[PDB]
Amino acid sequence: LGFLGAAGSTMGAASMTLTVQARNLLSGIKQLQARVLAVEHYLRDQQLLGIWGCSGKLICCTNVPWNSSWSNRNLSEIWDNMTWLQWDKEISNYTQIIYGLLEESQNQQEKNEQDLLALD
Amino acid sequence: LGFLGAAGSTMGAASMTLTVQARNLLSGIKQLQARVLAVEHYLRDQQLLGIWGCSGKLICCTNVPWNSSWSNRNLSEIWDNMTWLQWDKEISNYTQIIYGLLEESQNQQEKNEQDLLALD
Amino acid sequence: LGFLGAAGSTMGAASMTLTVQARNLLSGIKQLQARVLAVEHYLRDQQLLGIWGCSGKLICCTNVPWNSSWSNRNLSEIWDNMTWLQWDKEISNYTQIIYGLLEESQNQQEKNEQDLLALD
Amino acid sequence: NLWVTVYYGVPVWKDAETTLFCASDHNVWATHACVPTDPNPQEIHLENVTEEFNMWKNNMVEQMHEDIISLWDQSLKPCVKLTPLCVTLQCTNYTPNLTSMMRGELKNCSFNMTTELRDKKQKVYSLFYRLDVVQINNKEYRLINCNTSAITQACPKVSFEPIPIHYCAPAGFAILKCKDKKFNGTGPCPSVSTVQCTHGIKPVVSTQLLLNGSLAEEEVIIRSENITNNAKNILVQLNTPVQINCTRPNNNTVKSIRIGPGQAFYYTGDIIGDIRMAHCNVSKATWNETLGKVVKQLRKHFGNNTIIRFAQSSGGDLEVTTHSFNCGGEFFYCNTSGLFNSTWISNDSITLPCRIKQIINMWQRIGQAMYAPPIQGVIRCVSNITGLILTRDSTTETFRPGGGDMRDNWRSELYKYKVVKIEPLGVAPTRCKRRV
Amino acid sequence: NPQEIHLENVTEEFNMWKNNMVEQMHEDIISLWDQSLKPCVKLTPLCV
Amino acid sequence: IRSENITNNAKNILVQLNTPVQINCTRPNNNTVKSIRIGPGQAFYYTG
Amino acid sequence: EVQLVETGGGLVQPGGSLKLSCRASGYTFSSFAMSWVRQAPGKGLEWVSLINDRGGLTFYVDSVKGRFTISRDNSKNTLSLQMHSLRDGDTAVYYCATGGMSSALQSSKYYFDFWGQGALVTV
Numbered sequence A, B, C: 001l002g003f004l005g006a007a008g009s010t011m012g013a014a015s016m017t018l019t020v021q022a023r024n025l026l027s028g029i030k031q032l033q034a035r036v037l038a039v040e041h042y043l044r045d046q047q048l049l050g051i052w053g054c055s056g057k058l059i060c061c062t063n064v065p066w067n068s069s070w071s072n073r074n075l076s077e078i079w080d081n082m083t084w085l086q087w088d089k090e091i092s093n094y095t096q097i098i099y100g101l102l103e104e105s106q107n108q109q110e111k112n113e114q115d116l117l118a119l120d
Numbered sequence D: 001n002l003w004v005t006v007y008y009g010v011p012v013w014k015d016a017e018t019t020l021f022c023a024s025d026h027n028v029w030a031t032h033a034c035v036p037t038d039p040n041p042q043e044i045h046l047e048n049v050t051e052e053f054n055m056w057k058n059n060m061v062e063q064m065h066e067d068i069i070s071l072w073d074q075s076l077k078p079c080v081k082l083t084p085l086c087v088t089l090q091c092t093n094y095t096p097n098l099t100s101m102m103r104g105e106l107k108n109c110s111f112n113m114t115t116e117l118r119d120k121k122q123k124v125y126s127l128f129y130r131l132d133v134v135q136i137n138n139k140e141y142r143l144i145n146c147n148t149s150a151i152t153q154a155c156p157k158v159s160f161e162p163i164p165i166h167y168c169a170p171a172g173f174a175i176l177k178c179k180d181k182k183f184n185g186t187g188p189c190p191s192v193s194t195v196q197c198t199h200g201i202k203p204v205v206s207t208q209l210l211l212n213g214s215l216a217e218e219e220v221i222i223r224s225e226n227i228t229n230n231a232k233n234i235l236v237q238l239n240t241p242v243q244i245n246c247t248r249p250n251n252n253t254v255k256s257i258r259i260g261p262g263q264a265f266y267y268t269g270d271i272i273g274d275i276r277m278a279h280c281n282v283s284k285a286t287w288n289e290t291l292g293k294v295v296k297q298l299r300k301h302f303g304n305n306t307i308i309r310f311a312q313s314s315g316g317d318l319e320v321t322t323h324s325f326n327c328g329g330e331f332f333y334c335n336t337s338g339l340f341n342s343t344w345i346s347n348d349s350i351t352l353p354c355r356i357k358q359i360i361n362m363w364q365r366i367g368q369a370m371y372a373p374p375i376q377g378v379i380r381c382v383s384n385i386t387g388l389i390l391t392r393d394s395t396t397e398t399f400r401p402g403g404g405d406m407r408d409n410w411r412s413e414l415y416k417y418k419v420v421k422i423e424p425l426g427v428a429p430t431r432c433k434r435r436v
Numbered sequence E: 001n002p003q004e005i006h007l008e009n010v011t012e013e014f015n016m017w018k019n020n021m022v023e024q025m026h027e028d029i030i031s032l033w034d035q036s037l038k039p040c041v042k043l044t045p046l047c048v
Numbered sequence F: 001i002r003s004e005n006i007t008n009n010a011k012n013i014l015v016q017l018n019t020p021v022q023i024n025c026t027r028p029n030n031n032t033v034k035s036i037r038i039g040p041g042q043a044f045y046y047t048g
Numbered sequence G: 001e002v003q004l005v006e007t008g009g010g011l012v013q014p015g016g017s018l019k020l021s022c023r024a025s026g027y028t029f030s031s032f033a034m035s036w037v038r039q040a041p042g043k044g045l046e047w048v049s050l051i052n053d054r055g056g057l058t059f060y061v062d063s064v065k066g067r068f069t070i071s072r073d074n075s076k077n078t079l080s081l082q083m084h085s086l087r088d089g090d091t092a093v094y095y096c097a098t099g100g101m102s103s104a105l106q107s108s109k110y111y112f113d114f115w116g117q118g119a120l121v122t123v
């Protein structure tokens, strides 16, 4: 479909086009500043993915349970009957909570891994 | 040997010096633009490696079979009797095909991993 | 505690605040040059972590033994009775040796992994 | 038994020099050159961190100096170049019958000025201060700049009032604050905190006496690179302000003439009422207490039973022999020899005469002169004296006012701050072995 | 050969009166205009 | 002997020597230089 | 000065459950790994379970791996062991012990250090 072609498709359809858009995030003092800022934004998103334990991944699973209050919808009405723009709006008030939990979860897992590697 | 010291060596000899050259990819408006462009090129290559499922790796193996038409040579005449410059010239017409297959292969594997993590 | 809040704490206490400071590494020609340089430094540190086999990790274990001459202290007097600034000063003369060993160790392991994937 | 474990995000840093950016919230200094400030900046106390500071090797001062000069020069680019004024002037004494200290000051000078059309000339009469006009041989005079430099007329709509500037570190760097109360500018600080940006520092330009800015919290602090080397300046930070009330009592009437196609020159046309001298008032009791405290602290470096003598400055240009400052847009050069004369052996105000100049050669430079337009009416300003710049000249030590190097007016606020580079990567032994 | 990708089910709110592309176009055009007059002749001898 | 074409006579030929040839150049006149001020902070230098 | 005191029930019928606990004092609870060891009335000592200092990692002998749960609360300085099914072969005196593991940044243990009074569980 091309860049943003899946924007109007359902979440479970648009989830198969992640590489199409990922490849378009990287591809006159004000223009140079714009390029530097675009690089900084890319690196900040990559840093967030790294902190959560998701390095070379576009889809990564975590150990943070869904708390229902964030969204109490069925899977059959999110992935099959909703777009990513609608979902993003629906949980825009909770994105700074979930991310914090994700960071804490990785911090515990990373330390646990170290302890499992210290058993002779 | 140092940076590019293995350029005249065989592919199977030059494959042991990947860190020497990897470390030299990062190490006046026009000069600042040149530095920003060098950063953008580095990040684009890292993005391609990430998409293919190769994150913190210099040598990574994939699930795309060699199709022979790309090059029907024996391993004994590629790694032992050829340089990387000659190889790069030999398959310069196929690099945009192989990369596409690599992206598709990771997309299938990544989804398969998700499904294997949904079995109780 | 916040950014650098653990600077005066012991190494085994400060090791639990790595995400707090990692998130603060990314967050007018001279100012643009300063921003480009900050990006280059970030990428050089990430490249060193990648070469050593540590990609999306803040704590990673290696196969390089401690050689004692670098520091012959007990674990009980490093992690419990020392800060990271004191440790950094104590081994500042050896950081270019350890890193070299780390690169060599990964080079051997990466090749070994390839060989283990060529056994039918 | 132990293996190398790599940690990223380690709370360590090293001394570094980097480019800082400004934040702030017309004027010769401006906010469009800076970013918005943080309404709620943070400061993180480091409970067990002791760091070594050295205010005399702090590279933040050199950057502040360069940035202030660059802003000053940029603010004079879209303004009027007064090249038509390097002409012969025919001057007489404006009020020759005065018996006050202004006899001989303020000359009524006539000249043939250019106008909008290149074919015509305009006869102009204006008043100039004696210090701005050099006799060449009504008598023939020239402007003082014709000998060495061109004059740019400062834009009359651009204010010279200092605006606090906050210096902020780029990502990857941090600013450490001493937070000690008796810190003398060098040595360790056992109460270091981490900040993102400095407090707002007003770019106040002055000599001898430091006006406005921060005060010491517990006692007068004597700061010097060496103390025993008499070639260095001594920066005295007071713990109480001393109020100084400065005025320009003359009700000047300002006229404006067009000197070219879209350019105009401003000059003093006349003075309404009596002619009075500009001056500053400092009270005797407050100043005497201030000097008593300064002497008490000086005796801790040069010993007790040592006589401490204050004296007026000696030679050099008015920029260094007088107290130079900008009061409401006018440039005052106050004598100060009533403030620094005394020997200390183990409501009654002091009035300091002040001279005013219109041709300013700022930042110790030659070739770039500025003309300060006159300001209509009477000027009054009240400032706080927050510190002094002293130089040291047996049993008696003599201290004199010094100054003129503006970096010493900034290496007096930027003394508690240090810039450090964060080094988040490090290694340490653990018992953790990679699975392999 | 520029591309255009139709979004089959995307409806977006537009406001031409708050579109910041106009302010940039205005600034860029003025800057180009002024730059094109820099290496040219200043007619100060004509104010006669 | 280096040339883009050799046979095209419109191109230059760059000849790189393997030994230097020393050339001794002089301006034997003992010129006395004077300086006059031509403006507020500007001066012109000429042979007096 | 280290005191480890076990509490919990005694005799239950086959198929029931019991929650045992251990109160610790005299040392920093959160600084040491903790474990449970049992001794049948006529036998020697048998290790039953191990929990690390942070409570995140638990280990069991295969004979109880699917039946016993070990947990700790570092704010209450309290351990607990919840046993399900309760087989005849589980009759033993259970002891609370400090040691058996370390956390990579501490020196190795691989031994049990402090032992509690013990409590007898019967089926």
Ligand SMILES: *[C@@H]1O[C@H](CO)[C@@H](O[C@@H]2O[C@H](CO)[C@@H](O[C@@H]3O[C@H](CO)[C@@H](O)[C@H](O[C@H]4O[C@H](CO)[C@@H](O)[C@H](O)[C@@H]4O)[C@@H]3O)[C@H](O)[C@H]2NC(C)=O)[C@H](O)[C@H]1NC(C)=O
Pocket: D159, D160, D161, D162, D204, D205, D206, D211, D212, D325, D326, D327, D328, D329, D380, D381, D382, D383, D384
């Ligand atoms: C140390 O700090 C003190 C306090 O900030 C400072 O004194 C203050 O200076 C300002 C600037 O001169 C004074 O503000 C002026 O007050 C007069 C009152 O008549 C106004 O007319 C002024 O406005 C005119 O000038 C402006 C340009 O400056 C124009 O933009 C405006 O349109 C008017 O034409 C202006 O508001 C302020 O009143 C004093 N404070 C006191 C208590 O008098 C002092 O100068 C500082 N020290 C140094 C060395 O700078």
Ligand SMILES: *[C@@H]1O[C@H](CO)[C@@H](O[C@@H]2O[C@H](CO)[C@@H](O)[C@H](O)[C@H]2NC(C)=O)[C@H](O)[C@H]1NC(C)=O
Pocket: D318, D321, D322, D335, D336, D337, D338
């Ligand atoms: C500042 O004022 C003092 C006087 O208060 C000036 O010093 C006097 O200078 C005159 C010569 O003009 C001498 O005759 C007096 O004896 C001096 N008095 C003292 C106490 O030294 C001083 O020159 C003035 N400085 C400036 C820069 O104007």
Ligand SMILES: *[C@@H]1O[C@H](CO)[C@@H](O)[C@H](O)[C@H]1NC(C)=O
Pocket: A005, A006, A008, A009, A010, A013, E007, E008, E009
């Ligand atoms: C748009 O919605 C229709 C259903 O109304 C669907 O058939 C079509 O595939 C959607 N288009 C995209 C690009 O998702």
Ligand SMILES: *[C@@H]1O[C@H](CO)[C@@H](O)[C@H](O)[C@H]1NC(C)=O
Pocket: A067, A069
């Ligand atoms: C879910 O969110 C609510 C509100 O923030 C919170 O009180 C609750 O504890 C959360 N659930 C869990 C399991 O933490």
Ligand SMILES: *[C@@H]1O[C@H](CO)[C@@H](O)[C@H](O)[C@H]1NC(C)=O
Pocket: A074, A076, A077
């Ligand atoms: C969600 O699932 C429940 C079953 O738990 C069902 O009753 C309900 O109708 C479902 N809702 C939707 C929108 O599918």
Ligand SMILES: *[C@@H]1O[C@H](CO)[C@@H](O)[C@H](O)[C@H]1NC(C)=O
Pocket: A089, A090, A091, A092, A093
């Ligand atoms: C977020 O919270 C605000 C109230 O602060 C509320 O008006 C808004 O609707 C919330 N967003 C969503 C998606 O519910």
Ligand SMILES: *[C@@H]1O[C@H](CO)[C@@H](O)[C@H](O)[C@H]1NC(C)=O
Pocket: B005, B006, B008, B009, B010, B013
């Ligand atoms: C160059 O080729 C020769 C064989 O002709 C080989 O022995 C030598 O090692 C090669 N050099 C490098 C740097 O590979």
Ligand SMILES: *[C@@H]1O[C@H](CO)[C@@H](O)[C@H](O)[C@H]1NC(C)=O
Pocket: B067, B069
């Ligand atoms: C190999 O390449 C040819 C030409 O592109 C193609 O027709 C053939 O199908 C490829 N082989 C496989 C297994 O796809």
Ligand SMILES: *[C@@H]1O[C@H](CO)[C@@H](O)[C@H](O)[C@H]1NC(C)=O
Pocket: B074, B076, B077
């Ligand atoms: C490649 O391998 C084949 C065996 O399948 C052999 O017959 C041929 O000679 C080899 N070619 C080279 C260049 O080694």
Ligand SMILES: *[C@@H]1O[C@H](CO)[C@@H](O)[C@H](O)[C@H]1NC(C)=O
Pocket: B089, B090, B091, B092, B093
């Ligand atoms: C690539 O294709 C062109 C024809 O389009 C051909 O001339 C060239 O030789 C090919 N490259 C290789 C390495 O065979």
Ligand SMILES: *[C@@H]1O[C@H](CO)[C@@H](O)[C@H](O)[C@H]1NC(C)=O
Pocket: C005, C006, C008, C009, C010, C013, D046, D047, D048
């Ligand atoms: C500072 O040291 C004291 C012990 O002297 C310790 O109790 C305190 O927690 C330390 N502060 C930090 C932030 O590590």
Ligand SMILES: *[C@@H]1O[C@H](CO)[C@@H](O)[C@H](O)[C@H]1NC(C)=O
Pocket: C067, C069
């Ligand atoms: C430890 O360092 C010393 C000095 O560099 C070296 O001689 C020694 O061989 C090192 N130990 C090992 C095991 O290599």
Ligand SMILES: *[C@@H]1O[C@H](CO)[C@@H](O)[C@H](O)[C@H]1NC(C)=O
Pocket: C074, C076, C077
């Ligand atoms: C280090 O461990 C040894 C045991 O091998 C012990 O004798 C020594 O006292 C310890 N030192 C410290 C500082 O804990």
Ligand SMILES: *[C@@H]1O[C@H](CO)[C@@H](O)[C@H](O)[C@H]1NC(C)=O
Pocket: C089, C090, C091, C092, C093
């Ligand atoms: C590093 O080596 C120098 C000698 O070259 C020595 O003076 C210094 O103390 C050493 N550093 C440490 C931390 O021992």
Ligand SMILES: *[C@@H]1O[C@H](CO)[C@@H](O)[C@H](O)[C@H]1NC(C)=O
Pocket: D088, D089, D090, D110, D111, D112
């Ligand atoms: C102005 O110019 C006239 C000649 O046009 C001359 O006589 C007169 O003295 C000049 N006045 C001054 C003040 O230079």
Ligand SMILES: *[C@@H]1O[C@H](CO)[C@@H](O)[C@H](O)[C@H]1NC(C)=O
Pocket: D134, D147, D148
């Ligand atoms: C002219 O300038 C020189 C230095 O450039 C200075 O020595 C001289 O005194 C000046 N002339 C007058 C009249 O002040």
